[PDB]
Amino acid sequence: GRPRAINKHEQEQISRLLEKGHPRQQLAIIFGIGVSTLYRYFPASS
DNA sequence: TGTTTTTGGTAAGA
DNA sequence: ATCTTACCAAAAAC
């Protein structure tokens, strides 16, 4: 239905970014997606 | 004009 | 203020 905002490629690039200690809140402004989307794909339990 | 799927503002948090 | 999370109305898509 609705196209995702982040494809499996980013799901890895972003994951890496966050693994290097990157702020989801910033990792969102820049990319374009909202913070809830990001926390949903990358729980703080990640 | 209608169903699906995923988004995102947002309130809420022993 | 700051960080997390699940909602759930609805944008996006056909």
Domains and CATH numbers, chain A: 1-46 (1.10.10.60)
Q: Any idea which nucleotide's C1' is nearest the CA of A28?
A: B8
* CA→C1' distance for A42 and C6 (Å): 14
Are A35 and A10 in contact by the 8 Å Cβ rule? The answer is no
**Way it was determined:** X-ray
Contact between the CB of A32 and strand B at under 7 Å: yes
For residue A3, say whether its CB is under 7 Å from any atom of strand C. yes
- Closest by CA to A40, choosing from A5, A16, A9, A13, is A5
Whether the Cβ atoms of residue A38 and residue A28 lie closer than 8 Å to each other: yes
Query: Which CB contacts under 8 angstroms, 24+ apart, belong to A33-41?
Result: A33/A5, A33/A6, A37/A5, A37/A6, A38/A14, A41/A6, A41/A11, A41/A14
Task: Give the nearest nucleotide to A24, CA to C1'.
Answer: C3
